[PDB]
CSV table of C-alpha atoms in Angstrom, one decimal:
chain,number,residue,atom,x,y,z
A,3,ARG,CA,-6.4,-1.2,-14.0
A,4,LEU,CA,-8.7,1.9,-13.1
A,5,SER,CA,-10.5,1.8,-16.3
A,6,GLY,CA,-14.7,2.6,-16.1
A,7,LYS,CA,-13.9,4.0,-12.2
A,8,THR,CA,-14.0,7.5,-11.2
A,9,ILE,CA,-12.1,8.3,-8.5
A,10,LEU,CA,-11.9,11.7,-6.5
A,11,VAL,CA,-8.6,12.7,-5.7
A,12,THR,CA,-8.4,15.8,-1.9
A,13,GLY,CA,-4.7,17.6,-2.3
A,14,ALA,CA,-4.0,17.2,-5.6
A,15,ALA,CA,-1.9,20.1,-6.6
A,16,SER,CA,0.5,18.4,-4.3
A,17,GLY,CA,3.5,16.6,-5.3
A,18,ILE,CA,1.7,12.8,-4.1
A,19,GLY,CA,-1.2,13.9,-5.8
A,20,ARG,CA,-0.1,15.0,-8.5
A,21,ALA,CA,1.6,11.8,-9.3
A,22,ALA,CA,-1.3,10.5,-8.5
A,23,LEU,CA,-3.7,12.2,-10.8
A,24,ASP,CA,-1.2,11.3,-13.6
A,25,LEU,CA,-1.1,7.5,-12.9
A,26,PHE,CA,-4.7,6.9,-12.7
A,27,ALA,CA,-5.2,8.5,-15.7
A,28,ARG,CA,-2.7,6.7,-17.6
A,29,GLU,CA,-5.0,3.9,-16.1
A,30,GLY,CA,-8.5,4.8,-17.6
A,31,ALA,CA,-9.6,6.6,-14.3
A,32,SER,CA,-12.3,9.2,-14.7
A,33,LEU,CA,-11.2,12.3,-12.2
A,34,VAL,CA,-12.2,14.8,-10.1
A,35,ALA,CA,-9.4,16.9,-8.7
A,36,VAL,CA,-9.6,18.6,-5.7
A,37,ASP,CA,-7.5,21.6,-3.9
A,38,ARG,CA,-7.3,24.9,-1.7
A,39,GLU,CA,-4.7,26.2,-4.0
A,40,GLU,CA,-6.5,27.4,-7.1
A,41,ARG,CA,-3.7,28.1,-9.3
A,42,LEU,CA,-1.7,24.8,-9.4
A,43,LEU,CA,-4.3,22.7,-9.4
A,44,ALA,CA,-5.7,24.4,-12.9
A,45,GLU,CA,-2.3,23.5,-14.2
A,46,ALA,CA,-2.6,19.9,-13.0
A,47,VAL,CA,-5.6,18.9,-14.6
A,48,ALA,CA,-4.8,21.0,-17.8
A,49,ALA,CA,-2.3,18.2,-18.5
A,50,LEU,CA,-4.2,15.4,-18.0
A,51,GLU,CA,-5.5,13.2,-21.3
A,52,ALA,CA,-8.1,12.0,-19.3
A,53,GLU,CA,-11.9,13.1,-18.4
A,54,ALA,CA,-11.2,15.2,-15.5
A,55,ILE,CA,-12.4,18.1,-13.5
A,56,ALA,CA,-10.6,20.6,-10.7
A,57,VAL,CA,-13.1,21.6,-8.0
A,58,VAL,CA,-11.1,24.5,-5.6
A,59,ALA,CA,-11.9,23.9,-1.9
A,60,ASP,CA,-10.7,23.8,1.8
A,61,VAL,CA,-12.2,20.0,2.8
A,62,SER,CA,-11.5,21.4,6.5
A,63,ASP,CA,-15.3,22.9,6.3
A,64,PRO,CA,-18.0,20.5,6.1
A,65,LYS,CA,-20.5,22.5,3.6
A,66,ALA,CA,-17.1,22.6,0.9
A,67,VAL,CA,-16.7,18.9,1.3
A,68,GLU,CA,-20.4,18.7,0.8
A,69,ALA,CA,-20.4,20.4,-2.4
A,70,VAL,CA,-17.5,18.7,-3.1
A,71,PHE,CA,-19.0,15.3,-3.0
A,72,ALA,CA,-22.1,16.5,-4.9
A,73,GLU,CA,-20.5,18.1,-7.7
A,74,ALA,CA,-18.5,15.1,-8.6
A,75,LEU,CA,-22.1,12.6,-8.6
A,76,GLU,CA,-23.4,15.5,-11.0
A,77,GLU,CA,-21.2,15.3,-13.3
A,78,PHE,CA,-19.9,11.6,-13.3
A,79,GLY,CA,-23.3,9.8,-11.8
A,80,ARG,CA,-21.2,7.7,-9.7
A,81,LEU,CA,-18.0,6.8,-7.1
A,82,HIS,CA,-15.5,4.0,-7.2
A,83,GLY,CA,-13.0,5.6,-5.3
A,84,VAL,CA,-11.7,8.5,-2.7
A,85,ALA,CA,-7.8,8.9,-2.9
A,86,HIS,CA,-7.5,11.3,0.2
A,87,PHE,CA,-4.2,13.2,0.2
A,88,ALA,CA,-5.1,16.4,2.4
A,89,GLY,CA,-4.6,14.5,4.9
A,90,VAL,CA,-0.8,14.7,4.5
A,91,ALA,CA,-1.3,18.6,3.5
A,104,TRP,CA,2.5,22.1,13.7
A,105,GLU,CA,0.2,21.8,16.3
A,106,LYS,CA,-2.9,23.5,14.7
A,107,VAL,CA,-1.9,22.2,10.9
A,108,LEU,CA,-2.3,18.7,12.5
A,109,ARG,CA,-5.7,19.1,13.8
A,110,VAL,CA,-7.6,20.9,10.8
A,111,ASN,CA,-5.7,17.6,8.6
A,112,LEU,CA,-7.6,15.4,11.3
A,113,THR,CA,-10.8,17.4,11.1
A,114,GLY,CA,-10.7,17.4,7.2
A,115,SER,CA,-9.9,13.5,7.3
A,116,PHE,CA,-12.5,12.9,9.5
A,117,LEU,CA,-14.6,15.1,6.8
A,118,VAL,CA,-13.4,13.3,3.8
A,119,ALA,CA,-14.2,10.1,5.0
A,120,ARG,CA,-17.7,10.4,6.3
A,121,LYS,CA,-18.8,12.2,3.0
A,122,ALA,CA,-17.2,9.3,1.1
A,123,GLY,CA,-18.7,6.2,3.4
A,124,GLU,CA,-22.4,7.8,2.7
A,125,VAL,CA,-21.4,8.3,-1.0
A,126,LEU,CA,-19.6,4.9,-2.4
A,127,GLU,CA,-21.4,1.3,-3.8
A,128,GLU,CA,-20.4,-1.6,-3.4
A,129,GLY,CA,-16.7,-2.4,-3.9
A,130,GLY,CA,-15.8,1.0,-3.4
A,131,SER,CA,-12.0,2.2,-2.0
A,132,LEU,CA,-11.5,5.2,0.6
A,133,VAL,CA,-7.4,5.3,1.0
A,134,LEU,CA,-7.3,7.7,3.8
A,135,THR,CA,-3.2,9.4,4.4
A,136,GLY,CA,-1.0,10.1,7.5
A,153,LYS,CA,-7.4,2.9,17.8
A,154,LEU,CA,-6.1,6.7,17.4
A,155,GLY,CA,-5.6,9.4,15.1
A,156,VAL,CA,-6.0,8.5,10.8
A,157,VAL,CA,-5.3,4.4,11.8
A,158,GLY,CA,-8.2,4.4,14.3
A,159,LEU,CA,-10.6,6.3,11.9
A,160,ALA,CA,-10.1,4.2,9.4
A,161,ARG,CA,-10.1,1.2,11.0
A,162,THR,CA,-13.8,2.4,12.8
A,163,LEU,CA,-15.0,2.8,9.1
A,164,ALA,CA,-13.1,-0.6,7.8
A,165,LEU,CA,-15.8,-2.0,10.3
A,166,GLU,CA,-19.2,0.4,9.9
A,167,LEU,CA,-18.8,0.2,5.8
A,168,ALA,CA,-17.9,-3.5,5.3
A,169,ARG,CA,-21.7,-4.2,5.6
A,170,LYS,CA,-21.9,-1.7,1.9
A,171,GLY,CA,-18.3,-4.1,0.4
A,172,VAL,CA,-16.5,-0.5,1.1
A,173,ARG,CA,-13.1,-0.9,1.9
A,174,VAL,CA,-11.2,1.8,4.1
A,175,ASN,CA,-7.0,1.6,4.1
A,176,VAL,CA,-4.4,4.1,5.0
A,177,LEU,CA,-1.0,4.9,3.4
A,178,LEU,CA,1.4,6.5,5.6
A,179,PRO,CA,4.5,7.9,3.4
A,180,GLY,CA,8.0,8.3,5.2
A,181,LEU,CA,10.2,10.7,3.7
A,182,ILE,CA,9.4,12.1,0.2
A,183,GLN,CA,11.7,13.8,-2.5
A,194,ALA,CA,22.2,16.5,-0.7
A,195,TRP,CA,21.9,13.1,-1.5
A,196,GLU,CA,23.9,12.0,1.0
A,197,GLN,CA,21.9,13.9,3.7
A,198,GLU,CA,19.3,11.6,1.8
A,199,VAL,CA,20.6,8.2,3.2
A,200,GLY,CA,19.8,8.7,7.1
A,201,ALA,CA,15.9,8.8,5.5
A,202,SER,CA,15.1,5.3,5.7
A,203,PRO,CA,16.9,1.4,6.1
A,204,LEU,CA,16.6,1.7,2.0
A,205,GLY,CA,19.0,4.5,2.1
A,206,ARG,CA,17.2,6.9,0.5
A,207,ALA,CA,13.7,9.6,0.1
A,208,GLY,CA,10.9,8.2,-1.7
A,209,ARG,CA,9.4,9.5,-4.9
A,210,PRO,CA,5.8,10.7,-5.3
A,211,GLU,CA,5.4,8.1,-7.7
A,212,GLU,CA,5.9,5.9,-5.1
A,213,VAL,CA,3.2,6.7,-3.0
A,214,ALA,CA,0.6,7.6,-5.8
A,215,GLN,CA,1.5,3.7,-6.9
A,216,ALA,CA,0.7,2.1,-3.3
A,217,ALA,CA,-2.3,4.4,-3.6
A,218,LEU,CA,-3.4,2.4,-7.3
A,219,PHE,CA,-3.1,-1.3,-5.5
A,220,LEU,CA,-5.5,-0.8,-3.1
A,221,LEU,CA,-7.9,1.7,-5.3
A,222,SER,CA,-7.9,-1.2,-7.7
A,223,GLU,CA,-10.1,-4.4,-8.1
A,224,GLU,CA,-6.5,-6.0,-7.6
A,225,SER,CA,-7.2,-5.7,-3.7
A,226,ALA,CA,-10.9,-6.3,-2.9
A,227,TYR,CA,-10.4,-8.3,0.0
A,228,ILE,CA,-8.0,-5.9,1.5
A,229,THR,CA,-9.9,-3.1,4.1
A,230,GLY,CA,-8.2,-1.8,7.5
A,231,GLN,CA,-4.9,-1.9,6.6
A,232,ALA,CA,-2.4,0.8,7.5
A,233,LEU,CA,0.4,0.9,5.1
A,234,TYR,CA,4.0,2.4,5.5
A,235,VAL,CA,5.6,3.7,2.3
A,236,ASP,CA,8.6,5.0,3.7
A,237,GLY,CA,12.0,2.6,2.9
A,238,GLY,CA,11.8,0.9,6.8
A,239,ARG,CA,11.9,4.1,8.5
A,240,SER,CA,8.8,3.3,11.1
A,241,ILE,CA,10.5,-0.4,11.3
A,242,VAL,CA,11.1,0.3,15.5
B,2,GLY,CA,4.3,-7.5,-18.0
B,3,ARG,CA,4.6,-6.5,-14.7
B,4,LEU,CA,7.5,-9.1,-14.0
B,5,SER,CA,9.1,-8.9,-17.1
B,6,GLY,CA,12.4,-9.7,-17.4
B,7,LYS,CA,12.1,-11.0,-14.0
B,8,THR,CA,12.9,-14.8,-12.6
B,9,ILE,CA,11.0,-15.3,-9.4
B,10,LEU,CA,11.5,-18.4,-7.0
B,11,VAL,CA,7.8,-19.8,-5.6
B,12,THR,CA,7.6,-22.4,-3.4
B,13,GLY,CA,4.4,-24.2,-2.6
B,14,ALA,CA,4.1,-23.9,-6.2
B,15,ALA,CA,1.2,-26.7,-6.8
B,16,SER,CA,-0.8,-25.5,-3.6
B,17,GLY,CA,-4.2,-23.0,-4.5
B,18,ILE,CA,-2.3,-19.8,-3.8
B,19,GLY,CA,1.2,-20.7,-5.2
B,20,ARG,CA,-0.7,-22.3,-8.3
B,21,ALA,CA,-2.6,-19.0,-8.7
B,22,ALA,CA,0.6,-16.9,-8.1
B,23,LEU,CA,2.6,-19.2,-11.1
B,24,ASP,CA,-0.1,-18.8,-13.6
B,25,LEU,CA,-0.4,-14.8,-12.7
B,26,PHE,CA,3.3,-14.3,-12.5
B,27,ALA,CA,3.7,-15.7,-16.1
B,28,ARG,CA,0.9,-13.9,-17.3
B,29,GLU,CA,3.1,-10.8,-16.2
B,30,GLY,CA,5.6,-12.0,-18.2
B,31,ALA,CA,8.0,-13.7,-15.1
B,32,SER,CA,10.4,-16.7,-16.0
B,33,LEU,CA,10.0,-18.6,-12.8
B,34,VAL,CA,11.4,-21.9,-10.8
B,35,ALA,CA,8.6,-23.6,-9.6
B,36,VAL,CA,9.1,-25.6,-5.7
B,37,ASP,CA,7.3,-28.1,-4.2
B,38,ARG,CA,6.9,-31.6,-2.5
B,39,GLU,CA,3.9,-33.1,-4.5
B,40,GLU,CA,5.7,-34.5,-7.7
B,41,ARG,CA,2.6,-35.4,-9.9
B,42,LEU,CA,0.9,-32.2,-8.9
B,43,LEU,CA,3.4,-30.1,-9.4
B,44,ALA,CA,4.4,-31.5,-13.2
B,45,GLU,CA,1.4,-31.5,-14.3
B,46,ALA,CA,0.5,-27.3,-12.9
B,47,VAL,CA,3.7,-26.2,-14.5
B,48,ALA,CA,3.4,-28.2,-18.3
B,49,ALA,CA,0.2,-26.4,-18.3
B,50,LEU,CA,2.3,-22.8,-18.0
B,51,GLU,CA,3.1,-21.3,-21.3
B,52,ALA,CA,5.9,-19.8,-19.7
B,53,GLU,CA,9.8,-20.2,-19.2
B,54,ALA,CA,9.9,-22.3,-15.7
B,55,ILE,CA,11.7,-25.0,-14.2
B,56,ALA,CA,9.7,-27.6,-11.9
B,57,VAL,CA,11.7,-28.6,-9.0
B,58,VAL,CA,10.7,-31.3,-6.6
B,59,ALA,CA,12.1,-30.1,-2.7
B,60,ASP,CA,11.2,-30.1,1.0
B,61,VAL,CA,12.1,-26.6,1.8
B,62,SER,CA,12.4,-27.4,5.8
B,63,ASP,CA,15.4,-29.3,4.7
B,64,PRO,CA,18.5,-27.1,4.5
B,65,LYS,CA,20.5,-29.3,1.6
B,66,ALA,CA,16.8,-29.7,-0.3
B,67,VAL,CA,17.0,-24.9,-0.4
B,68,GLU,CA,20.8,-25.2,-1.0
B,69,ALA,CA,20.4,-27.2,-4.0
B,70,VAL,CA,17.0,-25.8,-5.5
B,71,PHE,CA,18.7,-21.7,-5.1
B,72,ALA,CA,21.7,-23.3,-6.9
B,73,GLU,CA,19.9,-25.0,-10.0
B,74,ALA,CA,17.6,-21.2,-9.7
B,75,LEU,CA,20.9,-19.6,-10.6
B,76,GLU,CA,22.5,-22.5,-13.3
B,77,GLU,CA,19.3,-22.0,-15.5
B,78,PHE,CA,18.5,-18.4,-15.3
B,79,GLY,CA,21.9,-16.7,-14.2
B,80,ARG,CA,20.0,-14.3,-11.8
B,81,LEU,CA,17.1,-14.1,-9.5
B,82,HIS,CA,15.0,-11.3,-8.8
B,83,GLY,CA,11.7,-12.7,-6.6
B,84,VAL,CA,11.3,-15.0,-4.2
B,85,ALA,CA,7.2,-15.7,-3.1
B,86,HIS,CA,7.0,-18.2,-0.1
B,87,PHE,CA,4.0,-20.0,-0.1
B,88,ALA,CA,4.9,-23.0,1.4
B,89,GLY,CA,4.9,-21.1,4.8
B,90,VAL,CA,1.1,-21.2,4.8
B,91,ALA,CA,1.0,-25.3,3.6
B,92,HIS,CA,-1.1,-27.2,5.2
B,93,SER,CA,-3.1,-24.7,6.8
B,94,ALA,CA,-7.2,-26.4,6.7
B,95,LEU,CA,-5.0,-29.1,7.8
B,100,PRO,CA,-5.5,-32.2,17.3
B,101,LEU,CA,-3.1,-29.1,18.9
B,102,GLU,CA,-0.3,-31.7,19.1
B,103,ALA,CA,-0.2,-32.4,14.4
B,104,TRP,CA,-1.2,-28.7,14.8
B,105,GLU,CA,2.3,-27.2,16.2
B,106,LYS,CA,4.1,-29.4,14.4
B,107,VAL,CA,2.9,-27.8,11.2
B,108,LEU,CA,3.3,-24.7,12.2
B,109,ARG,CA,6.9,-25.3,13.9
B,110,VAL,CA,7.9,-27.1,10.5
B,111,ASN,CA,6.5,-24.6,8.7
B,112,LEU,CA,8.6,-21.7,10.3
B,113,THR,CA,11.6,-23.7,9.8
B,114,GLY,CA,11.1,-23.5,5.8
B,115,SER,CA,10.5,-20.2,6.6
B,116,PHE,CA,14.5,-19.2,8.2
B,117,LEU,CA,15.7,-21.1,5.3
B,118,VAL,CA,14.1,-20.1,2.1
B,119,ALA,CA,15.0,-16.2,3.9
B,120,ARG,CA,18.1,-16.5,4.5
B,121,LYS,CA,18.9,-18.3,1.3
B,122,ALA,CA,17.0,-15.6,-0.6
B,123,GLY,CA,18.6,-12.6,1.2
B,124,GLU,CA,22.2,-14.7,-0.2
B,125,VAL,CA,21.0,-14.3,-3.8
B,126,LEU,CA,18.7,-11.8,-4.1
B,127,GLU,CA,20.4,-8.9,-5.7
B,128,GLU,CA,20.1,-4.8,-5.6
B,129,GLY,CA,16.2,-4.3,-5.7
B,130,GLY,CA,15.1,-7.6,-5.2
B,131,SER,CA,12.3,-9.0,-3.4
B,132,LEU,CA,11.2,-11.9,-0.5
B,133,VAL,CA,7.7,-12.4,0.2
B,134,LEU,CA,7.3,-14.4,3.6
B,135,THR,CA,3.3,-15.7,4.6
B,136,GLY,CA,2.0,-16.9,7.7
B,137,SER,CA,-2.2,-17.3,8.1
B,138,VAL,CA,-4.4,-15.4,10.3
B,139,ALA,CA,-7.3,-17.7,9.5
B,140,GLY,CA,-9.3,-18.9,12.9
B,141,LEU,CA,-7.5,-17.0,15.2
B,142,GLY,CA,-8.5,-15.6,18.4
B,143,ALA,CA,-7.3,-12.7,21.1
B,144,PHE,CA,-4.0,-13.8,22.0
B,145,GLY,CA,-3.0,-14.9,17.8
B,146,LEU,CA,-4.0,-11.6,17.1
B,147,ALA,CA,-1.6,-9.8,19.6
B,148,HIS,CA,1.5,-12.0,18.5
B,149,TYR,CA,1.1,-11.2,14.7
B,150,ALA,CA,-0.1,-7.4,15.6
B,151,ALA,CA,3.0,-6.9,18.3
B,152,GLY,CA,5.2,-7.9,15.0
B,153,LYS,CA,8.3,-9.1,17.5
B,154,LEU,CA,8.0,-12.6,17.2
B,155,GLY,CA,7.2,-15.8,14.4
B,156,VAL,CA,7.0,-15.1,10.9
B,157,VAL,CA,6.5,-10.8,10.9
B,158,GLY,CA,9.7,-10.8,13.7
B,159,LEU,CA,12.0,-12.9,10.7
B,160,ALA,CA,10.7,-10.5,8.4
B,161,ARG,CA,11.1,-7.5,10.2
B,162,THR,CA,14.2,-8.3,11.3
B,163,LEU,CA,15.5,-9.4,7.7
B,164,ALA,CA,14.1,-5.9,6.1
B,165,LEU,CA,16.8,-4.2,8.6
B,166,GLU,CA,19.5,-6.5,7.8
B,167,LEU,CA,19.5,-6.5,3.8
B,168,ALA,CA,18.1,-3.1,3.1
B,169,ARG,CA,21.5,-2.1,2.5
B,170,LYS,CA,21.9,-4.7,0.4
B,171,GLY,CA,18.6,-2.9,-1.5
B,172,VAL,CA,16.2,-6.9,-0.5
B,173,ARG,CA,13.3,-5.5,0.1
B,174,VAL,CA,11.3,-8.3,2.9
B,175,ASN,CA,7.3,-8.3,3.5
B,176,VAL,CA,4.8,-10.8,4.7
B,177,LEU,CA,1.3,-11.8,3.9
B,178,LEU,CA,-1.4,-12.9,6.0
B,179,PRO,CA,-4.0,-14.4,4.2
B,180,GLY,CA,-7.5,-14.7,5.8
B,181,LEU,CA,-9.7,-17.4,4.9
B,182,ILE,CA,-9.0,-18.4,1.2
B,183,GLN,CA,-11.1,-20.9,-0.7
B,184,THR,CA,-8.9,-23.9,-2.2
B,185,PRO,CA,-9.3,-27.2,-2.7
B,186,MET,CA,-8.3,-28.4,0.6
B,187,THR,CA,-11.1,-26.0,2.5
B,188,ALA,CA,-14.1,-28.1,0.5
B,189,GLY,CA,-13.2,-30.6,3.5
B,190,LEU,CA,-14.2,-28.4,5.9
B,191,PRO,CA,-17.2,-28.8,8.3
B,192,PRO,CA,-20.1,-26.0,7.0
B,193,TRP,CA,-20.0,-25.1,10.2
B,194,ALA,CA,-16.2,-24.1,10.5
B,195,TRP,CA,-16.8,-22.5,7.1
B,196,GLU,CA,-19.7,-19.8,8.4
B,197,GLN,CA,-18.3,-18.9,11.7
B,198,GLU,CA,-14.5,-17.7,10.1
B,199,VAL,CA,-17.0,-16.2,7.1
B,200,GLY,CA,-19.2,-14.9,10.0
B,201,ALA,CA,-15.6,-13.0,11.6
B,202,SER,CA,-14.4,-11.4,8.3
B,203,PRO,CA,-15.9,-8.2,8.4
B,204,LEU,CA,-16.5,-8.1,4.3
B,205,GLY,CA,-18.9,-11.2,4.6
B,206,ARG,CA,-16.7,-13.9,2.6
B,207,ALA,CA,-13.9,-16.2,1.5
B,208,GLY,CA,-10.8,-14.8,-0.6
B,209,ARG,CA,-10.0,-15.9,-3.8
B,210,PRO,CA,-6.2,-17.8,-4.5
B,211,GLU,CA,-5.9,-14.8,-7.6
B,212,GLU,CA,-6.2,-12.4,-4.5
B,213,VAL,CA,-3.4,-13.1,-2.5
B,214,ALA,CA,-1.4,-13.7,-5.7
B,215,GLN,CA,-2.4,-10.0,-6.8
B,216,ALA,CA,-1.4,-9.1,-3.3
B,217,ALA,CA,2.4,-10.5,-3.9
B,218,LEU,CA,2.8,-9.2,-7.3
B,219,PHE,CA,2.3,-6.0,-6.3
B,220,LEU,CA,5.1,-7.0,-3.4
B,221,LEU,CA,7.5,-8.7,-5.8
B,222,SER,CA,7.1,-5.8,-8.8
B,223,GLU,CA,8.3,-2.2,-8.5
B,224,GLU,CA,5.1,-0.9,-7.9
B,225,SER,CA,6.4,-1.7,-4.3
B,226,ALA,CA,10.0,-0.4,-4.9
B,227,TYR,CA,9.8,2.0,-1.5
B,228,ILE,CA,7.9,-0.9,1.2
B,229,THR,CA,9.3,-2.8,3.5
B,230,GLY,CA,9.2,-4.5,6.9
B,231,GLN,CA,5.5,-4.3,5.8
B,232,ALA,CA,2.7,-7.4,7.5
B,233,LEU,CA,-0.4,-7.2,4.8
B,234,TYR,CA,-3.4,-8.6,5.7
B,235,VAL,CA,-5.2,-10.5,3.0
B,236,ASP,CA,-8.6,-11.0,4.9
B,237,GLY,CA,-11.3,-9.4,4.6
B,238,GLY,CA,-10.9,-7.2,8.2
B,239,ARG,CA,-10.9,-10.3,9.9
B,240,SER,CA,-7.6,-9.0,12.2
B,241,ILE,CA,-8.9,-6.0,12.6
B,242,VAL,CA,-10.9,-6.9,15.2
């Protein structure tokens, strides 16, 4: 489903980030795994049976983002997708995540080739950013979409997390991201897709 | 396959999108109950499949036809895992009066298939409803975006009610899709619609079928109440 493609993954040492790396590798993708946590990221990539590199970086820093995408292109020549999980990495932390989403999205926009796919995570905020870039980048054929996980994994307390009576699994968010990066979703851009068991149905 | 061991009921199974879904779901290991009003078109469509499949001629706006088609599906296959209701966009490519009755009748079919699917689908099952966002202006889009009424309202209301049983309900909103019935469109109208989609082309039947397969398979087990637009970005602005 991702054979022949290079995907850059931010927040790749995180629970969800890691489930994505594993699923994308089994589906034939080559990977640029990016995270600020050096120790866990080194472990995450070592375990893969795929063509992969690990890049230590702070994606809220404009110079480090510039460096990250240059290394990806130097190694694999061409970038086909970006799954931005650091968008889900309390007031100041949210502001810094928004700054990182902006910087990764704009750089992905310039660097991604025709038919490429940008998946962000969360008119205003990350959704407004995705829809604005979806319009700017449709000329290149680049698709821009957003994934909004709900509560992702005592067992009884989790029943109240969503109408479906459970919390989500990291692998389920990773599965939504695969759909959106793959050629199965070539005509889908500007979409906000909730992976939350119905939690946001209000 | 991605639907192995699953039985799927497909309405509008002789149409362009419906038929591309039959072929894709069959290639992915599903067994199928193919439902449509046009007999000769449905008989030919099913005969070409190399899957476990029955064909049933029925009008899904008729409450007794709906009860019968679901009863037949259970008698044949024992249990039902998914419903892809492509009759929800029947006669999409076609006078205000005639247009309203098409939408009204389609909404009737969506109600009846949704309720019956809700009754018979088992834990972890998936009902995929449909609506069309091709040719819509500012108010049409607001109606879909708000999610309170029409097909999106139905799906979101049912998602809440069926979540206890473990059943997911989602809706597919195709934009302009290149089916055979779209050939008889004036070129000026086709181009007006292509020009309204940021990606600058029509969708293919197969692409709407892939969105439905995602929604019916176990890869979307935590997703319910969602409106998924397959419109090349047409509805963004």
